[PDB]
């Protein structure tokens, strides 16, 4: 009866029908939310209590990805906030550590030249006698 007024609004922040369509084509949904924060890699995190619990907090993947978005691109900083483990975004909590050995996030790399492959981590135990010397 009055969802159009919401619908027009979604366009305005979207940037006109042209950017609205690309948003719909990408996220498969148009939703109103407040930008909670931005991670190191460009993903923008939104929140709106209007929606029900599961759909309450959502993420916009970085534009350059454009269709390779994965569930595994979420860095550990925001990971808890995104799965409702906490109600406190990383900006609003000071209990996060900043150790020097922490590593930047990475995808799950499978079927790729960058994948994992196991190997025994122990050098061989028995030494063979060398005849040459």
């Amino acid at each position: 009866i009055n969802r159009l007024t919401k619908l027009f609004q979604m366009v305005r922040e979207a940037g006109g029908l042209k950017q609205a369509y690309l948003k719909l084509y990408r996220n498969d949904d148009l939703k109103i939310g407040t930008l909670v924060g931005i991670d190191k890699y460009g993903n923008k995190y939104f929140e709106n209590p209007y929606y029900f619990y599961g759909r309450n907090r959502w993420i916009e993947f970085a534009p350059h990805v454009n269709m390779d978005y994965d569930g595994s691109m979420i860095p550990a900083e925001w990971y808890g906030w995104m799965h409702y483990k906490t109600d406190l975004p990383p900006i609003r909590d000071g209990c996060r550590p900043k150790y020097k050995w922490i590593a930047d996030h990475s995808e799950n790399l499978s079927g790729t030249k960058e994948a994992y492959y196991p190997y025994s981590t122990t050098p061989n135990k028995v030494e063979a006698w060398e005849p040459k010397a």
Binding site: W101, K113, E114, A115, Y116, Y117, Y119, S120, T121, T122, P123
Partner: protein
């Protein structure tokens, strides 16, 4: 690539002639760069005055079991669990 010949902190590496490197032609060999032996060595020792002190890993219930160390000897003393060093002067 570089990673194949890299030697891990545990001291293992496949010889350049060993066939087992074949597994890495289509994958990578992550060798961790944050070697614990060097990071703990970096942290300086803690000077104390009392004859015996305790280390619990630094965060009580989130650390390791509380162990007491005796500082009578000259050399700085290592904690069994965390590796931190203590010294009395």
């Amino acid at each position: 690539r570089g990673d194949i010949e890299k030697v891990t902190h545990t001291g293992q590496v496949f010889d350049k002639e060993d066939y087992r490197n074949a597994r890495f032609v289509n994958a990578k060999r992550y060798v961790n760069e944050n070697w614990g032996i060097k990071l703990i060595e970096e942290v300086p020792p803690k000077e104390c005055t009392e004859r015996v002190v305790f280390c619990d890993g630094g965060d009580g219930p989130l650390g390791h079991p509380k162990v007491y160390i005796n500082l009578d000897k000259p050399g700085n003393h290592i904690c069994g669990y965390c590796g931190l060093r203590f010294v009395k002067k």
